[model samples]
Target: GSIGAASTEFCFDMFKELKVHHVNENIIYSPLSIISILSMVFLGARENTKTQMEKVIHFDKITGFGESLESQCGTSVSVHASLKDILSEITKPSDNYSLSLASKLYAEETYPVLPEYLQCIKELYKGSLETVSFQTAADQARELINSWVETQTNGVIKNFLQPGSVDPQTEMVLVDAIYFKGTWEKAFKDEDTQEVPFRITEQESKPVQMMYQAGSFKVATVAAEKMKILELPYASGELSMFVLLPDDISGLEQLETTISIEKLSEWTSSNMMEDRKMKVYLPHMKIEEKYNLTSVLVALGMTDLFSPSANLSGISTAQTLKMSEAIHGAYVEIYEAGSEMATSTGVLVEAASVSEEFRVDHPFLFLIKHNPSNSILFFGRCIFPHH
Candidate 1:
């Protein structure tokens, strides 16, 4: 669960470091979401490691260094240094021909989000001459993000980023956004998706029409814990979104405590059932959220990122430049593989053996993770389903 905890903490810290200035400026960080956009990078690194020579290990390298430096020094220094370190660590490995080659390939193949982010920044700065156009800035950002999704997904996630979702001129200076669209390799027939009674919890239940599939799946059941975990592969099993549901509603909390990175590894590696009858009803949901990350970052001791006295000379052309805030937003669409039809966003995080379940009869926490390596790119808790 260290990875899960670290991922969650990093997500909170990243948002906090990016948003503090906006609060002071009286800006609102709206419709912002963050999901681990790390799929391409993590997957590419994993595949490369398997095929390449024996000097590749890509587990928590960036976060490990970032967390260490942030804990030792401060956020401002740590943020800059960490970015440099991450870039260097990935590029400086032995047996690799060139750093730029690896970086370029990784960025191009795996991280479509980078260019989108860059484009947003460029357009916003370019259009700022007339006035501080918050709407333009936000729209430009959304367009760029959605464009990336459309390109990478081969049009599976059309209009992944929604417009008018960000307001740049608010006192809250930071904004962050993320979007993910994945299709299942084996498309589920439309007939399978039907209205069924979903046991939200022991006390309450809802008649929700969920995506149902009955077939052979990579299934793992924890006999001791009375829990069933399933891995639903997307795009020909290249990637997967896993769900861990407790047979008993009360088992959720205990599963969370007992779940671990190693256990999850074991489950994925060993617990897959060959042919099984799986009645799956995945709900279609959308979550738009906004929150201040200042206290959270301060709690983690990353104060300098928000300090005017702090140094972010790396990004600013002038000495007066400092990170004011970070605002993030995200939209996700998950569909049955090959089925152009059903799609929605939001899910929970499942670690190696840790049992984190999103039995969303009501509000709950969720995470978006990269398959195989199990790296969390985004984490969020939905207190209200209506939003």
Candidate 2:
């Protein structure tokens, strides 16, 4: 299988865990960013730690990939090489979109990371591990990393490494951040936006600037799931934001329980969805979220990497060395004029039938998909579009 498919599997696995904790709050994260960073960590892992990470991240599913430092082990394909290719494609320069996926490692000067491991990360991942005075100046190191993250994300993410989250004894930290801004293929008119009451619950609601537009879009219906799926293409037509909305105001909970990679593939499959003209009402939204994924990773069978029994021998010879922290942050914004930051067959379709409406004034699950690789760049749920 391709890394794209494995990343999608990881997406649902991670999302289910986050959903359990963020039932009523807005959830947004970059699964691709997390996996990309983890791929760096995977380069240094050995023994059980490597085995466990491969399973949790679904890297084992990638063809010809296994326990080897060789991303292209003796002429075989390299996971790192494959992953970097996708990253470059996804972040390629385009007139209509801007996306940045950045990662770095800050290791305490004392650990002395191996040159081979460092070389692999630099050559394959294009990421470097910098020596910081974690032992002498923990606070300064924290600020340094946080500042780098803020700059990487265009100020959308700030203070990524919170105070006291790192200290003198800390040995290593892996940080990743993703920022995306894309214009729609068919821009929504600012004059058409209206403040509408967005249904928050069966009895409660709040006002939102619901933007409207009419255009031909790839849409589908899951009769059994009682949900509607809508795909909005970005200007380049290589990426799209797919939104899953339930028919009932309270059906999001049920829908969450039934989500799986197999089902998601089926729900959004080309045969299952088709292009049709419709009226779309999506709220103007902006959300930024940061996560301390230590516990979640531990629960997901990645226990060895964070525990004393951890074996990161590939990264450093320091027998005691193990990952101490995993932090991720993501940001997204949607507005009337494309992203603050599409159309076809209108004449013929207009005479066929009345346009169907896909109103998203309620809770829904949305993900930005890189069409070529089918990797989920960003995934989240909008319970309340409160910026």
Candidate 3:
């Protein structure tokens, strides 16, 4: 599969499952992070095992992909190598924002190591391979791996591995985490924000801190309802937030099924939307999500790797092992500014006239996307738009 395109579709499938299970709560996750982590292991899979995994994430559907030096078996380009350039292109060091993804593999001592495999992982995915005595030090190894993940994610995630997530018989483990924060290039003043009544459903409403601002924004209305989309760019301009709001208070359920990567492709294409002036109001949100992804992956037909007869011999020649654990945790906070209020002498006070208006006083789904590559950095559901 082509790296970017395949990953985008994978994100859509991941979101579809999350929407089914999360029902009526705030949900946040990083599909790219989960895909990249598993794709690393997919690099070493062979035979029937490889086929199952490739189809599980739909990597088998990607076509016309060229070979890269970092790939070990010549199937696809390394996800890490592809992301290094894409992340660098959209990221700005001086801007008030932070975006990063970190991954690693923890192996048991009995597992055999291959130099070619180690080199590909380190060079292509920018990850490290560490060996620990899971045979005797299961608890200790778990703590060290969780500690490393916590540090890498800037403490955005903790207790990633639960009490029994690792055991003495465990052989291989994969972990990934993503963190992001950026200021709005045009923002709402804190003084204007107030406790607004946010509709949770057709029958319920809750008081929430709602942030408001107005500017020339790229927006459009799509089918099935008056579901409008609004784009809010970060200071770097290459990254933007796309908020999808349905007019009916109970329409989020329909929108969830209607919007897909295909719909996103059509909606995000430049011609489908137009930049116009509008007054925009959004709620300040902080959402947390944690998943034991093994069940979900198996539900999606990725059961081979978890089987005892699994052939993951590509990772090591002298030993046989299978993926023992798959766990992920994510945190997201959205507000007006990152560091401080951007000072502007006249722009802050002078009103730019915009006749249209978009107010988000109901449930919605939103995503942070890297514009150039059409990558989904983060996706979330905001039913309880506040604490």
lDDT score of residue 304 within candidate 2: 81
Count of clashes, each model: 43, 3, 1
lDDT of 2 by residue, 204-226 (tens): 99999999999899999997999
Q: Which stretches of candidate 3 lie over 4 Å from their true place?
A: 65-74, 77-96, 339-387
Whole-model lDDT, candidate 1?
0.39
Worst 10-residue lDDT window, candidate 2: 342-351
Best by TM-score: 2
Model 2 TM-score on a 0 to 1 scale = 0.84
Off by over 4 Å in 2: 65-78, 340-387
- Pick by lDDT: 1 or 2, better one: 2
What are the root-mean-square deviations of the candidates from the true structure over C-alphas? 17.1, 16.1, 16.2
Instruction: For candidate 1, write residues 1-387 as lDDT tens digits.
Output: 122333444443444455444432322222112222221111212122211201111124333333422232222233234334433443343431211201111011111223333332232211111112333454654455455445443454456433332334221122222223446755667777777776766778888656766666767787887788877776645446677888887887576555654565556565354446666667644433333343443454434434444433322223222223332332344444432221112111111223333445666788999998899988999877673
CA-RMSD of model 3? 16.2
Clash pairs, candidate 2, are: 71-78, 185-342, 186-342
